[PDB]
PDB file of C-alpha atoms and ligand atoms in Angstrom:
ATOM      1  CA  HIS A   1     -80.342   5.433-238.904  1.00  0.00           C
ATOM      2  CA  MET A   2     -82.436   2.469-239.885  1.00  0.00           C
ATOM      3  CA  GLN A   3     -86.037   1.974-238.781  1.00  0.00           C
ATOM      4  CA  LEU A   4     -86.977  -1.144-236.831  1.00  0.00           C
ATOM      5  CA  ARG A   5     -90.589  -2.227-236.406  1.00  0.00           C
ATOM      6  CA  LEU A   6     -91.373  -5.171-234.113  1.00  0.00           C
ATOM      7  CA  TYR A   7     -94.878  -6.617-234.293  1.00  0.00           C
ATOM      8  CA  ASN A   8     -97.245  -9.616-234.212  1.00  0.00           C
ATOM      9  CA  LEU A   9     -96.089 -10.938-230.834  1.00  0.00           C
ATOM     10  CA  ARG A  10     -97.784 -14.110-229.689  1.00  0.00           C
ATOM     11  CA  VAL A  11     -97.046 -17.102-227.510  1.00  0.00           C
ATOM     12  CA  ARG A  12     -98.301 -20.641-227.555  1.00  0.00           C
ATOM     13  CA  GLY A  13     -98.466 -22.893-224.521  1.00  0.00           C
ATOM     14  CA  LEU A  14     -97.226 -20.874-221.545  1.00  0.00           C
ATOM     15  CA  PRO A  15     -96.723 -22.937-218.381  1.00  0.00           C
ATOM     16  CA  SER A  16     -98.935 -22.672-215.309  1.00  0.00           C
ATOM     17  CA  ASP A  17     -98.405 -19.779-212.900  1.00  0.00           C
ATOM     18  CA  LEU A  18     -97.974 -20.508-209.188  1.00  0.00           C
ATOM     19  CA  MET A  19    -101.709 -19.892-208.993  1.00  0.00           C
ATOM     20  CA  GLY A  20    -103.619 -20.444-212.188  1.00  0.00           C
ATOM     21  CA  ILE A  21    -103.127 -19.155-215.701  1.00  0.00           C
ATOM     22  CA  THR A  22    -100.099 -17.024-216.579  1.00  0.00           C
ATOM     23  CA  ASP A  23    -100.354 -13.246-217.116  1.00  0.00           C
ATOM     24  CA  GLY A  24     -97.849 -12.589-219.863  1.00  0.00           C
ATOM     25  CA  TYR A  25     -96.268  -9.431-221.230  1.00  0.00           C
ATOM     26  CA  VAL A  26     -93.237  -8.802-223.434  1.00  0.00           C
ATOM     27  CA  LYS A  27     -90.418  -6.294-222.899  1.00  0.00           C
ATOM     28  CA  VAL A  28     -88.551  -5.188-226.032  1.00  0.00           C
ATOM     29  CA  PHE A  29     -84.959  -3.946-226.443  1.00  0.00           C
ATOM     30  CA  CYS A  30     -82.830  -3.147-229.477  1.00  0.00           C
ATOM     31  CA  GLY A  31     -79.111  -2.669-228.968  1.00  0.00           C
ATOM     32  CA  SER A  32     -79.985  -2.340-225.284  1.00  0.00           C
ATOM     33  CA  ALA A  33     -82.245   0.648-226.049  1.00  0.00           C
ATOM     34  CA  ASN A  34     -85.512   0.037-224.139  1.00  0.00           C
ATOM     35  CA  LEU A  35     -88.362   0.083-226.659  1.00  0.00           C
ATOM     36  CA  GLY A  36     -91.097  -0.547-224.096  1.00  0.00           C
ATOM     37  CA  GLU A  37     -93.451  -3.341-223.122  1.00  0.00           C
ATOM     38  CA  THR A  38     -96.824  -4.761-224.080  1.00  0.00           C
ATOM     39  CA  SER A  39     -99.851  -4.677-221.832  1.00  0.00           C
ATOM     40  CA  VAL A  40    -100.437  -7.710-219.652  1.00  0.00           C
ATOM     41  CA  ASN A  41    -102.616 -10.356-221.282  1.00  0.00           C
ATOM     42  CA  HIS A  42    -104.262 -11.645-218.113  1.00  0.00           C
ATOM     43  CA  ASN A  43    -105.022 -15.301-217.518  1.00  0.00           C
ATOM     44  CA  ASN A  44    -104.073 -16.395-221.003  1.00  0.00           C
ATOM     45  CA  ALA A  45    -101.868 -19.419-221.803  1.00  0.00           C
ATOM     46  CA  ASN A  46    -101.861 -18.549-225.526  1.00  0.00           C
ATOM     47  CA  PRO A  47    -101.720 -14.759-225.708  1.00  0.00           C
ATOM     48  CA  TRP A  48    -101.322 -12.540-228.710  1.00  0.00           C
ATOM     49  CA  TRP A  49    -100.744  -8.792-228.384  1.00  0.00           C
ATOM     50  CA  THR A  50    -101.918  -5.922-230.538  1.00  0.00           C
ATOM     51  CA  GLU A  51     -99.003  -3.666-229.544  1.00  0.00           C
ATOM     52  CA  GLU A  52     -96.108  -2.817-231.823  1.00  0.00           C
ATOM     53  CA  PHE A  53     -92.736  -1.193-231.235  1.00  0.00           C
ATOM     54  CA  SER A  54     -90.636   1.127-233.357  1.00  0.00           C
ATOM     55  CA  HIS A  55     -87.044   2.302-233.089  1.00  0.00           C
ATOM     56  CA  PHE A  56     -85.971   4.929-235.600  1.00  0.00           C
ATOM     57  CA  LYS A  57     -82.288   4.826-234.692  1.00  0.00           C
ATOM     58  CA  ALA A  58     -81.545   1.144-235.263  1.00  0.00           C
ATOM     59  CA  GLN A  59     -78.561  -0.315-237.104  1.00  0.00           C
ATOM     60  CA  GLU A  60     -78.188  -3.634-238.923  1.00  0.00           C
ATOM     61  CA  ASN A  61     -76.850  -6.316-236.569  1.00  0.00           C
ATOM     62  CA  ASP A  62     -78.086  -4.562-233.440  1.00  0.00           C
ATOM     63  CA  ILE A  63     -79.257  -7.211-230.981  1.00  0.00           C
ATOM     64  CA  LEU A  64     -83.048  -7.462-230.676  1.00  0.00           C
ATOM     65  CA  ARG A  65     -83.966  -8.790-227.225  1.00  0.00           C
ATOM     66  CA  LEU A  66     -87.466  -9.982-226.345  1.00  0.00           C
ATOM     67  CA  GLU A  67     -88.307 -10.874-222.745  1.00  0.00           C
ATOM     68  CA  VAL A  68     -91.492 -12.749-221.870  1.00  0.00           C
ATOM     69  CA  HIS A  69     -92.530 -12.110-218.266  1.00  0.00           C
ATOM     70  CA  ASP A  70     -95.413 -13.160-216.044  1.00  0.00           C
ATOM     71  CA  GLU A  71     -96.912 -10.264-214.081  1.00  0.00           C
ATOM     72  CA  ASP A  72     -97.304 -11.026-210.369  1.00  0.00           C
ATOM     73  CA  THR A  73     -98.186  -8.977-207.291  1.00  0.00           C
ATOM     74  CA  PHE A  74     -94.754  -8.925-205.598  1.00  0.00           C
ATOM     75  CA  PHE A  75     -92.135 -10.038-208.168  1.00  0.00           C
ATOM     76  CA  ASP A  76     -92.652 -10.613-211.897  1.00  0.00           C
ATOM     77  CA  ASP A  77     -91.139 -13.855-213.233  1.00  0.00           C
ATOM     78  CA  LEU A  78     -89.005 -13.895-216.363  1.00  0.00           C
ATOM     79  CA  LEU A  79     -90.103 -16.912-218.405  1.00  0.00           C
ATOM     80  CA  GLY A  80     -87.806 -16.641-221.418  1.00  0.00           C
ATOM     81  CA  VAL A  81     -85.567 -14.451-223.547  1.00  0.00           C
ATOM     82  CA  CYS A  82     -85.187 -14.391-227.318  1.00  0.00           C
ATOM     83  CA  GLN A  83     -82.210 -12.601-228.865  1.00  0.00           C
ATOM     84  CA  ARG A  84     -80.954 -12.144-232.387  1.00  0.00           C
ATOM     85  CA  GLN A  85     -79.107  -9.757-234.673  1.00  0.00           C
ATOM     86  CA  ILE A  86     -81.451  -7.750-236.873  1.00  0.00           C
ATOM     87  CA  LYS A  87     -81.207  -7.915-240.661  1.00  0.00           C
ATOM     88  CA  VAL A  88     -82.577  -5.638-243.352  1.00  0.00           C
ATOM     89  CA  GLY A  89     -85.979  -6.761-244.632  1.00  0.00           C
ATOM     90  CA  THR A  90     -89.009  -8.403-243.054  1.00  0.00           C
ATOM     91  CA  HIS A  91     -88.474 -11.530-240.981  1.00  0.00           C
ATOM     92  CA  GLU A  92     -90.622 -14.007-239.072  1.00  0.00           C
ATOM     93  CA  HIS A  93     -89.192 -15.900-236.121  1.00  0.00           C
ATOM     94  CA  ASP A  94     -90.016 -18.189-233.236  1.00  0.00           C
ATOM     95  CA  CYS A  95     -88.267 -18.809-229.948  1.00  0.00           C
ATOM     96  CA  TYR A  96     -88.530 -21.490-227.266  1.00  0.00           C
ATOM     97  CA  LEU A  97     -88.904 -19.998-223.794  1.00  0.00           C
ATOM     98  CA  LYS A  98     -86.840 -21.468-220.953  1.00  0.00           C
ATOM     99  CA  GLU A  99     -89.843 -21.979-218.662  1.00  0.00           C
ATOM    100  CA  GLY A 100     -92.081 -23.339-221.417  1.00  0.00           C
ATOM    101  CA  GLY A 101     -94.013 -22.203-224.459  1.00  0.00           C
ATOM    102  CA  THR A 102     -92.927 -20.672-227.738  1.00  0.00           C
ATOM    103  CA  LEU A 103     -92.819 -16.979-228.683  1.00  0.00           C
ATOM    104  CA  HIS A 104     -93.513 -15.977-232.311  1.00  0.00           C
ATOM    105  CA  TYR A 105     -92.814 -12.511-233.710  1.00  0.00           C
ATOM    106  CA  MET A 106     -92.012 -10.489-236.827  1.00  0.00           C
ATOM    107  CA  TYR A 107     -89.873  -7.464-237.486  1.00  0.00           C
ATOM    108  CA  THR A 108     -89.148  -5.161-240.381  1.00  0.00           C
ATOM    109  CA  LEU A 109     -85.826  -3.304-240.618  1.00  0.00           C
ATOM    110  CA  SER A 110     -85.851  -0.519-243.229  1.00  0.00           C
ATOM    111  CA  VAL A 111     -83.686   2.178-244.897  1.00  0.00           C
TER     112      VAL A 111
HETATM  113 CA1   CA B 201     -95.434 -16.304-211.491  1.00  0.00          CA
HETATM  114 CA1   CA B 202    -103.265 -15.262-213.612  1.00  0.00          CA
HETATM  115 CA1   CA B 203     -98.964 -14.019-212.639  1.00  0.00          CA
END
């Protein structure tokens, strides 16, 4: 087992919602294990989140998948997906979201 820690999620420049400012949250997977989701950062085009995510059964080269969604009343909209293979150490990354904006994040993979 290796330990993965995913943290410092933030987005710059989310697009408009159908009505007003987007209500973003991030869902986190590692090797298709569901690691959970952040709270919704309501009415914020440039959110950052305090939440962090750990996975104590990771392996090097597992695929980290980050999904940025907009919360809505009837159907949430998936704005973008960032995927990469995890490497030992601490790494900072950014990702351009299909529907607009850029996601920045860090992770640490250990032991
Ligand atoms: Ca929407
Ligand atoms: Ca809103
Ligand atoms: Ca919304």
